[PDB]
Symmetry: D5
């Protein structure tokens, strides 16, 4: 397994054509500097788990935008196929109008750079990446094909990284806003453990 | 360039080492878990901060995983002697107390490198978790930077979902929990969920 | 430019999933042994020239089947996108029901083997290949993106190759059924050239 | 199979001795910049299908010249053999006086650069190339030895490429002058399809 | 084949790392000791058996070395957090108690490999000790297999001898201690010792 | 620095000519199986620190023989030079009659195998090796040229390795026969530490 | 300069299509075992010096066949061009009906094996080779493009090699049948030099 | 077969010691710029065919010098052996006083550059080279050991190259001065072929 | 400097054509097994020092033959040149009738194998080799071009090597038949030195 | 067999510690520029043929110094062993006081450069080298272990090289001072050969 994606290092640069509000637009990772970004890959347009994940993030995108965070989805399908899918009604396994960009990776170069490409199948697995305002990679989540991801877990992780960025204390297992934190010092730590 | 032997949908890399199990040193192997699901996770360092909260959370809930034919094993680069010293230290001083899950030692760093979780510049791992099925095949990978702990709730949800899809041949939507709707993976069959 | 496709050599083998009468089926080049095959690539589902080419071959495939010849189309799109496009009406730029298989090449392996893959774009150009009953490649036609191919010219070529296979004389520029042919021999050829 | 000829990229440069109006002259691809060029190879002088193709193009060269297009033929034979074949009468399998250049590729360099050389036989197959005013390669047609090409199809393709260069619409399967075209965007395309 | 950058009569390989010094974490470097002799020693593992007896022996006698412009530094592959936990553990439980010498951490294994003391199969060092002079040049190497501890008495004798020969230009016979006879290193001069 | 000498692995094999009781004899490391061996190198015959070390071990060799241990000395000098040195009286910086073998390493191969050869000088430094009855290397001591070794420290180390071999307890810093030992177990250890 | 042609070693094998009595036939070097062979290359059909060399050999081939010797000509031109040139009358620079085969080397492999190919021009220079009954190469003659060879000198050479093969005396500069020869011995040679 | 000798390209440079009028002198190929050169190798001094070739050229060298052409002979023998052979009378198989230089190639480098060295024997075969005024190689003739070359054929060739250099017509098979030539043009050639 | 000739190892094999009693014969090093051989190279036939050395050995060959020893001379010159030089009278710098073989090394292989070939000059220097009955090389003498060797010294060395082969004593500097020898051991040597 | 020693080329440079009049001194080959040098290797200190050779050259070194020539001996032994051997009386197989330097080659570098090192034994054979005033190597003599060299032959060779350097004629087999020489020219040589 080879990849350019390394936690605590700058996330690999990407550029491509995206569908945004029904139109074709050029989009780059660098466009997102100054904000957190949830960047996620899904296997294939017109399939099964995939539309449930894209719909989940689009319907709840306001929750991420309230905390200076954007969301971008990506597959190996072309931009013409993405638009056809957006126009397909939800009842027929389509998406309907979308509030997040759908990026196209026809050459497979972006998938390969992020280490999510399946050479035997010709598409990606379910891989999600959390990137900070400075462009640095903080988190990687990857699922086998039959099991979808969680919007709730994704929000929890974004909130935790922002908190530790700001305060310099660290977040225990299962942390949510309001939970106890730890001072990362051999003496300071006892204020939590006591 | 990041290198690893860990690939989703392929056999998880074999490992062998010394673990602390009920206060005793014992040889332990990945192959010992064939027939059961395994949550296998790495943590940075004994006697630190987020690490003990994660080990305690899993130990205190390990019965929930065992009820569904699933085991849990923890691993760091620390020696077996340091693991035992940490188990003897009380929770109020940042120790673990008695543990219900094995603590595996990776002194040589070979296991960490095989799983793609070793940080060359630091000499220890990041927070990496792996879900492995009863046939030894890798199903899931979760990796966090140092300051943020993982979730026992989410790990359980994922084990439940993989067990469901293995048994039923339907697939699980975003946010699935036991009792939630599922999809037939066919262009016509799918409409029973979507319509 | 690298490729495995060479005229007068065996055509490169391929295997993949195709949509045939609305269902997903495994298809291989060896399945067509004993027949002529017109095997063609097109750039992208839900685009512009591509649907006109597939429709033209679909609506006229009976002409080819009457002469022991089949037709197969291929793009880099998935089989799920192929089916979505077949379901879309012709008036919205869809295909409607199809009489020819649509093969999927998601991995790009088939495209690269045939020398038709565009690295910078991530899809194929317009490349058509004529393969005989023994699996030998006889003809290659490749067009840049904005210009479609011709069913009339493709039919003429299949007729000409079948004629030379059977009779052992050769077909002059612009030959159609009924036109004069040449004996491939230094004196025998002069029978044809007498009419000049 | 190795070649330098790639569609949508500049056609490989060539230079050599050609027979033009019964005389030996130096000729280069760059000589044709500013016009379209039909550049074609044939197997061997004094053979069978070959003279029928060269005759067909020569007798119709005025049709291409009327639309700013030139025609050049090429084989591995020497310039002395080319002239001998031109002097030979049509009734004896010769060419008679010619209106297009016949280029000699004695070293095989031009044939190898264009991907048309047969190593086992020592001559080319039937390969034709359509090149635009800017020197970019637009079309490749290749036939096995026993079947000749078509002047009618070649003319259609030159017409189609000139139309799309000028108007920015695209040409459907079987397009001829006067036929319907397509606007290449997701909503504009409906003018044609509906 | 054994490989190392440590060579007697050549500059000792540079090192940098985090050490525990008076209960605090501090960056420490070999170059910090220029101008003084240094006894630099590796030990296998924190919370083990012979190891604490060696660290305690040197700490409890470090004043004898400091009286002759010589310092002492200890090193293992353990982390700085484990070193501090071990310092806090009482001597009666196999701990160290308060320490007067730095404990250097080599988590990455780079320092151990540079000095030729790393055991690949085990993931920790053997018992290796190095004597380095005021100009940074290596003068002595002592290495023991795991079951047998080293001697503070012998280490002191060797420091004293090297300081004597540096200053006097005579050389030290087998078993030399301060006040013992020495030799002029010349074919004629030598007879003042031998006759 | 390269060497074949590794603690806890078999000591590198050696063979050569030695002076034993005034005569030339062939001697091999394998001759010593079943006994402990102190094998030591010294820089040069007719020098300064070197004869003091050889005399020290020879005069005290009975102490090692009482505990199933032999002693062998080695330098790069020839066997003819070794014999001339043995015949030289102690008062002239010679050795007098010897009770331990002096091995010759003229080719430098043994020195190189044990990692004690000085490439700039053409002789060894002061390197001593302790090897067990099974031929396994237990201890390495190496000194720069101006400072001699200790017979007393060498005896202490031999006694400690024999004790741990027999009993399976381990020896603390500064151990001598009669001193306390440790059971190498996380619970057993407390019998010593208490 | 690369070649497989070496005097006193076996001549490189060749096979190809030739025009023989106006028909196309496969022809090989080994077809000529048992006879001497004059094997010669010329630049190009329908040129200037070339037809004069080929005609001179065809017209006089009976002089070679009388002494168990055959003659073959070769160029890079196709067999279809060879036949066209043979059908062309001599007055128009053609050959007319031929008595010796014309071999075609379209792939250039035969020419490169014999060391006569001109890479810049794409054809051969004027190279001639005399090959004995056992297939061994005896003589090489090579001319630049504007100067023709000699049937008379070629005949003299075949005669000389046939004489020395049979008698074991050697042939002085300019030998023709009936001329004086030399016994190749340091004493026997003096008979010749007496004159 | 390796060589630097290529027809229609510059002849390989050479320098060495030669015997000229019974004295030793350094000689170079570039000394002959402005004139044609016949440059020939022979196997061995004191042998059989060799003295006959060298004598024939020395005796007739005025015929070459009349048309701005020189002649040089070369073998692997030393300059001391060359002079001994020249001092030896013709009746005893020697040469007598010479009018052309004898070049020595003791190192074998000149012979290998010209492609005439026989590795199994340690000497050259019978190789002759015609080089024009600009230093360009025009002709190569190579014979196996038992058959001598021809001064008459060599003269014919020098005449033919000199004619074509000056006039730009070409020379048919067997041309001698006064014979018919060809204009090298597809129309102009028909004048010659009319006959 | 590269060579195959090494003292105390078997002399490199050689074969070639030699002049023996006015006739050309094949000769090999193995032909001399069972006798000592003086094998020597000289620069060039018809030169200056060379004939004086070949004459000196030929006129004295009976002295070597009386002690089971043969003599062979060699240069890069051909066998035909060798015979011409033999026929040439001594007053003219020739050899006259010879009693020793003259070997030809036209290919230079023998000279290169023995380390005596001069690459810049194309001939050998003055190299002499003494080889025993078992084919082992015992002695090498090499002179620059202007200075000849000595038959008296060569004879002395053959005598010395034969003596030490037979008796097992060793020959001091300047030994001749009748001189004192040495027993090669540390106590036995005193018979000579005292 | 590899070596840097080549006749008619510059002798390989060397530097080392030698015993000269009982003291240790640094010595280099370049120190002898302007003089002839006889540079010889011997196997081992405290052995048998070796002392006889060193003594013979030491006792006769005045003959060489009278003709602008020096002598230097070398073995793989240390300078401390060299001194011990010089101190040992001749009657016990020692050298006694020496008039020539004894060079030490502990690293074996000098021996390998001169092509005289025996790999299996760890010491040199008996190799002698004659070097001129300009540093050019003129002569090599090498003997197997049991047979000593000759001072008489060495002297003759130095005399012959000095003669040819000065006068430009060459020395026949067995030349000694007073013997006839040859003009190196094809006719001039016949002056010498007239006496035959």
């Amino acid at each position: 397994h080879l990849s350019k994606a390394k936690i605590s290092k700058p996330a690999p640069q990407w550029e491509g054509t995206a569908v945004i509000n029904g139109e074709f637009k050029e989009l780059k990772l660098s466009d997102y500097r100054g904000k957190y970004l949830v960047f996620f890959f899904y296997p294939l347009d017109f399939t099964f788990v995939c539309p449930t994940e894209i719909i989940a993030f689009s319907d709840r995108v306001h929750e991420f935008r309230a905390i200076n965070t954007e969301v971008v989805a990506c597959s190996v399908d072309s931009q013409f196929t993405h638009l056809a899918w957006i126009i397909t009604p939800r009842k027929q396994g389509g998406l309907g109008p979308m509030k997040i960009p759908l990026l196209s990776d026809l050459t497979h170069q972006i998938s390969k750079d992020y280490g999510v490409y399946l050479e035997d199948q010709g598409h990606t697995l379910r891989g999600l990446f959390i990137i900070d305002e400075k462009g640095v990679l903080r988190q990687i989540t990857m699922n086998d094909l039959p099991v979808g991801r969680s919007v709730d877990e994704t929000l929890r992780l974004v909130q935790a990284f922002q908190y530790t960025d700001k305060h310099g204390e660290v977040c225990p297992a299962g942390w949510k806003p309001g939970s106890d934190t730890i001072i990362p010092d051999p003496s300071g730590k006892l204020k939590y453990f006591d």
